[PDB]
Amino acid sequence: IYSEHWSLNPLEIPQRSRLFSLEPVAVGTPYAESLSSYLHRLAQAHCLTSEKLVMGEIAPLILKDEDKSELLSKNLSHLLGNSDAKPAINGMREMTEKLVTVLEELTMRQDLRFLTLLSWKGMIYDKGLFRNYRAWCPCCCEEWMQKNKTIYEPLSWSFKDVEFCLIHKQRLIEECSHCGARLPVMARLSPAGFCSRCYGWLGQEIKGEEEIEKYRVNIQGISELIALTPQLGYKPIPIELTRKLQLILLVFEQAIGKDVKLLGDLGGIMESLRIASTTNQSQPYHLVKLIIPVCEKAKISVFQLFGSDFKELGKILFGNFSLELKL
Amino acid sequence: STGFPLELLTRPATERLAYFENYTVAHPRLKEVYEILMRTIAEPAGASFIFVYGASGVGKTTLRLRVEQKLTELALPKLESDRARVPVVGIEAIAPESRYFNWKEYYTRALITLEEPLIDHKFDYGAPALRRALENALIHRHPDVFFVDEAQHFGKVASGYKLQDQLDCLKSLANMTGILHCLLGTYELLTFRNLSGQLSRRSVDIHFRRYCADSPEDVQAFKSVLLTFQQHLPLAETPNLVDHWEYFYERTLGCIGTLKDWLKRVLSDALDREATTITLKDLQKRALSVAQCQKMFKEIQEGERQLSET
Amino acid sequence: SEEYVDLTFKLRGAPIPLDNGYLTYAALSRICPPLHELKSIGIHPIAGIPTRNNLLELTAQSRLKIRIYHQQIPLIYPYLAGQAFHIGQNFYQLDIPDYKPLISSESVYSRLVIIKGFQDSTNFIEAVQRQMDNLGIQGKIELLTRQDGTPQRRQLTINKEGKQFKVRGFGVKISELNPEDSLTLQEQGIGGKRKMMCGIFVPATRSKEEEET
Ligand SMILES: Nc1ncnc2c1ncn2[C@@H]1O[C@H](COP(=O)(O)OP(=O)(O)OP(=O)(O)O)[C@@H](O)[C@H]1O
Numbered sequence: 017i018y019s020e021h022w023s024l025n026p027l028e029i030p031q032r033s034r035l036f037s038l039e040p041v042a043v044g045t046p047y048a049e050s051l052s053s054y055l056h057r058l059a060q061a062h063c064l065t066s067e068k069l070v071m072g073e074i075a076p077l078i079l080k081d082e083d084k085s086e087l088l089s090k091n092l093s094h095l096l097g098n099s100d101a102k103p104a105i106n107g108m109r110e111m112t113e114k115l116v117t118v119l120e121e122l123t124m125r126q127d128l129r130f131l132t133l134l135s136w137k138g139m140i141y142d143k144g145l146f147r148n149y150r151a152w153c154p155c156c157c158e159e160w161m162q163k164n165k166t167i168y169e170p171l172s173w174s175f176k177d178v179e180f181c182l183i184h185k186q187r188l189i190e191e192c193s194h195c196g197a198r199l200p201v202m203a204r205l206s207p208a209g210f211c212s213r214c215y216g217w218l219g220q221e222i223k224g225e226e227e228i229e230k231y232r233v234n235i236q237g238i239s240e241l242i243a244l245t246p247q248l249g250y251k252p253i254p255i256e257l258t259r260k261l262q263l264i265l266l267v268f269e270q271a272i273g274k275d276v277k278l279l280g281d282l283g284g285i286m287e288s289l290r291i292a293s294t295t296n297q298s299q300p301y302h303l304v305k306l307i308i309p310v311c312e313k314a315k316i317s318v319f320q321l322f323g324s325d326f327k328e329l330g331k332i333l334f335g336n337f338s339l340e341l342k343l
Numbered sequence: 344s345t346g347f348p349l350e351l352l353t354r355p356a357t358e359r360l361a362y363f364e365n366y367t368v369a370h371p372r373l374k375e376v377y378e379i380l381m382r383t384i385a386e387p388a389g390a391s392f393i394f395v396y397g398a399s400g401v402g403k404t405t406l407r408l409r410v411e412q413k414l415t416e417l418a419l420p421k422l423e424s425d426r427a428r429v430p431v432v433g434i435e436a437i438a439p440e441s442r443y444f445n446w447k448e449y450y451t452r453a454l455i456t457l458e459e460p461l462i463d464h465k466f467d468y469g470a471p472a473l474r475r476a477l478e479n480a481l482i483h484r485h486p487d488v489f490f491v492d493e494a495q496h497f498g499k500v501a502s503g504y505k506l507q508d509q510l511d512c513l514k515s516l517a518n519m520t521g522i523l524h525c526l527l528g529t530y531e532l533l534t535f536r537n538l539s540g541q542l543s544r545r546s547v548d549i550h551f552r553r554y555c556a557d558s559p560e561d562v563q564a565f566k567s568v569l570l571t572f573q574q575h576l577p578l579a580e581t582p583n584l585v586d587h588w589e590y591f592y593e594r595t596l597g598c599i600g601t602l603k604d605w606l607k608r609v610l611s612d613a614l615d616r617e618a619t620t621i622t623l624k625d626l627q628k629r630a631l632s633v634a635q636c637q638k639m640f641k642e643i644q645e646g647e648r649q650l651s652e653t
Numbered sequence: 654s655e656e657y658v659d660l661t662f663k664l665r666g667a668p669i670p671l672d673n674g675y676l677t678y679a680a681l682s683r684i685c686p687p688l689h690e691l692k693s694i695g696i697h698p699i700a701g702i703p704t705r706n707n708l709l710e711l712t713a714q715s716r717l718k719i720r721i722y723h724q725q726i727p728l729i730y731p732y733l734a735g736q737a738f739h740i741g742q743n744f745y746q747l748d749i750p751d752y753k754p755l756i757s758s759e760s761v762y763s764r765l766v767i768i769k770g771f772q773d774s775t776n777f778i779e780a781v782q783r784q785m786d787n788l789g790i791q792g793k794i795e796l797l798t799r800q801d802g803t804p805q806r807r808q809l810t811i812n813k814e815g816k817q818f819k820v821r822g823f824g825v826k827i828s829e830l831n832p833e834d835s836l837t838l839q840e841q842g843i844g845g846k847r848k849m850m851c852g853i854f855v856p857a858t859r860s861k862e863e864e865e866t
C-alpha cells in the first residue's frame with residue numbers, strides 16, 4: 017500500500033500589516049517624501065480618501081476613547097487639528113509624533129520617522145520653519161508624471177526658506193493656477209500633484225528667473241539636513257550637537273586670535289553662538305537663523321557638521337581656518 | 344505504518360472519527376497532479392492560467408488545501424523579514440442568486456480574504472473602485488498564486504460570448520498585477536479552457552483524471568487504496584474490504600473522495616452502534632443511489648469525451 | 654605607561670547588578686555611538702559595597718573607569734562629559750571625567766576573563782598562557798579561588814534580543830611580569846571582551862579584595 021499520510025494543518029504565518037507596506041520614496045536623499053504625501057499615497061493605494069482612511073484606522077489608535085464607527089463620520093480636523101494643520105505637520109509636533117508612531121505600528125515599517133523632523137525634536141526650533149500653505153514645484157510634477165514616476169511632495173517644499181527647486185531652478189508656486197486658492201496640506205482628498213480644491217492640475221513648465229544664489233545656501237543646507245537623518249543610524253544626542261557648536265565657536269575664537277579682521281565678518285555669529293551655548297543646551301536652535309549661517313561662515317556643509325565625528329570635524333575646521341591645532 | 348495508532352481503541356468514538364477524518368492518503372494520480380501543479384506554480388513560464396478539471400470528488404479541494412499549506416510553509420522562513428507578503432490566496436466562487444454572475448461580490452470577497460480595511464466605504468480615484476482596490480492589493484501584497492475554486496460558477500451567464508468575457512475580466516485583473524490564477528472546477532471549466540488566443544496561450548491545462556476500471560494498473564491502484572483505507576480504518580477488528588472491490592467501485596466511479604466519505608459514513612455508523620467490524624449491509628445502508636451514480640457517470644463521461652481532444 | 658589612560662567618571666545612581674557588563678555597555682553605546690566601533694577600549698569593574706541580592710550599592714569611591722588610547726579620547730569625551738544614561742529604569746549620572754595613568758605593579762589580576770570554547774580550568778590556563786605568549790609577556794598563571802579553594806568562575810549575561818547567552822570565565826592572577834611587560838599586560842589584557850567589561854587587568858590588591866568576599 018501507500019505509506020504517505022499527508023497533514024493539512026495550518027501553518028500560522030506571522031501577523032500581516034493592516035495597511036500596505038508602501039516604501040517611502042527617495043529616503044536619505046534631498047527629495048524624500050513628506051509624511052503627508054505618504055499618507056495620501058497610502059490612501060490612494062487602498063482606494064480610500066486620506067480622510068476616510070484616517071478615521072478608519074489611524075483615529076482609533078490615536079483617539080483612544082471614542083466609538084470607532086462614530087469616528088468614521090467626522091471631519092479630519094477632529095483628530096488632526098486643522099486649527100494648526102499647515103505643512104508644519106511634517107515637523108516635530110506632538111500630533112506628528114503620535115501619527116508617525118501609529119503609522120509605523122500599522123505597517124510595521126521602520127523608516128517613517130525619517131519622513132519628518134521628530135528626530136530633530138529639541139534640536140531645531142519649530143517657529144519660523146514651515147510654510148502655512150501647501151507649495152509645489154510644477155516642473156517636478158510634470159517631469160515625474162511624464163516619466164511615469166510616482167508623484168509626491170518632498171520635505172524641502174514644506175519649508176519657508178526653500179522657494180526654489182535646484183533641479184529645475186523654478187520658484188515654488190503656492191497658488192493653484194485654476195481656482196486661484198491656496199491648498200491646505202491636509203484635506204479630505206488631496207492626491208499629490210492635484211489641486212485639493214478644484215481637482216485641477218498643478219504641473220506646468222514654469223520658468224524661474226530670480227536670483228537663486230541668495231537662497232542656495234539655505235536650500236542646500238536644508239536638503240542636506242533631510243538627506244542626512246536616515247544615514248545617521250541613531251537618534252541624535254542634543255549635547256552632541258551643542259558641543260559641536262561649541263567646538264566651532266572655539267575654532268572661530270582661535271581664528272580671530274590669529275586674524276583680527278575676521279572679527280568684522282564673524283562678530284554677530286560669534287555672539288549668537290555664545291548666546292546659544294549659554295542658554296539651556298536642551299533648548300532647540302533656530303535652523304536657518306543660527307546653524308546654517310554658522311556652518312556657512314565655517315565653510316562647512318550641514319552634512320559635514322551633523323555627520324562627521326568630533327575628530328574629523330575638528331581637523332576640517334583647523335584646516336579651513338589654517339590653525340595648527342590637532343584634537 | 345500501515346496500521347492506525349493502537350491506543351485509539353480505548354479513546355472515545357469522537358477521537359477515532361477525528362483521526363479518520365483528518366487522515367488522507369496519497370494515491371498516484373493525486374501526487375502526480377500535485378507535482379505538476381507545484382512545478383507550474385514555481386515556474387509559470389509566462390502562463391497566467393493553470394485550469395484544473397476533474398470529476399466531483401477526485402480531490403480537487405484537498406489538492407488545493409495541500410498546495411496552499413505547502414507553499415505557505417515554503418515561504419514561511421522569510422515572512423518574518425517581509426510583511427504584507429501573503430504567500431498564497433485561495434477563495435471559492437459563489438453561484439449567483441440572480442441570473443448573471445455578480446462581479447462586485449467576487450471583488451469584495453477577494454478583498455475580504457486579503458484583510459482589506461474599510462472595504463465597504465472605498466472610493467474611486469478617477470464596480471471600478473472595487474476592481475482597482477483588488478488590483479492594488481494584489482500588486483502590493485504580492486501573492487504567489489490565486490486559487491479560485493468552483494470555477495464552473497463563473498459561467499453563470501445567459502450570453503454565450505459573455506461566458507469568455509468572465510475570463511476576460513479575470514484576465515484584465517491578472518495582467519495589471521501579474522498574479523497567477525489557477526482556477527479549479529468540475530468538467531464545466533471545459534467551455535472556458537482555450538477560447539480565444541489569449542486564453543489558449545497563457546493557460547496550462549491539468550486534468551485530475553479519475554481511476555477508470557479499464558486499465559489493470561488503475562484497478563490495482565484502486566484495490567491498493569481500498570487496502571490502505573481498510574488498514575487505516577480505526578476499528579477493533581479490520582474488516583475485509585478488498586474483496587468487494589467491484590461493489591466499492593460501482594458506487595464511487597473511482598473517485599477517491601467518494602470512497603473516503605462513504606467509508607467515513609460506514610465507520611461512524613459502526614462506532615455509534617459500538618460495532619467491531621464492517622458488514623456488507625453496513626456499506627449498503629449508506630451507499631449512493633443508483634440514479635445518482637448514473638448521473639455523475641454520465642457527466643464525467645461527457646467531460647472525458649470533451650477533454651479527449653488530441 | 655602614560656601612553657594609555659584610564660578615563661574615570663564619578664558615577665552615582667541606583668544600585669546595580671553585579672553582572673552588569675552588557676547593561677552598562679549597551680547604555681553607554683546608546684548615549685555614545687562611537688563607543689560601538691572602537692577597538693582598543695575597555696571598561697574597569699564598578700566598585701562599591703554589594704548587597705544580599707547580588708546587587709552593588711554605589712558609594713563615594715564607586716566610579717565608571719574606561720581604558721582608552723590617548724589618541725581616541727576626543728571621540729568619547731563629548732558624549733560622556735557630564736552626560737547621563739539609563740540602565741533599564743534606573744538613572745545614572747557621570748561627572749566631569751578625570752584622567753588616571755596606567756601604573757605598573759609587580760603582580761596583576763583580572764576579575765573575569767573569557768575565551769571562546771574553554772570551560773575547564775586547565776585548558777583555560779593553557780589558553781591564557783597562549784595569549785600570554787602571543788603578547789611577548791613573561792609570568793606565572795594562577796586562578797583566584799573561593800573560600801573552598803575551588804577556582805572561582807564568574808558569569809556574564811548578554812541579553813541580546815529576546816534571548817540571552819551565557820559565557821563563563823575565570824579570575825586570573827599573573828605575577829612576576831617585570832614592569833614593562835606588566836604595562837603591556839594591563840593595556841592589552843586577555844579575553845578580548847574588554848568592551849564587555851571583562852578583560853581589564855588591575856594591580857593585585859583588588860584580587861585580595863575579591864578573595865576576602
Ligand atoms: N485522496 C483522498 N484521500 C482522502 N480523503 C480524500 C481524498 N480526496 C478527497 N477526500 C475527501 O473528500 C472531501 C473533499 O472533497 P473532494 O476534494 O473529494 O471533492 P471535489 O468534488 O473534488 O471538490 P469540490 O466539490 O469542492 O469542487 C474531504 O472529505 C476529503 O477528506
Ligand SMILES: [Mg+2]
Binds near residue numbers: 402403405
Ligand atoms: Mg471538494
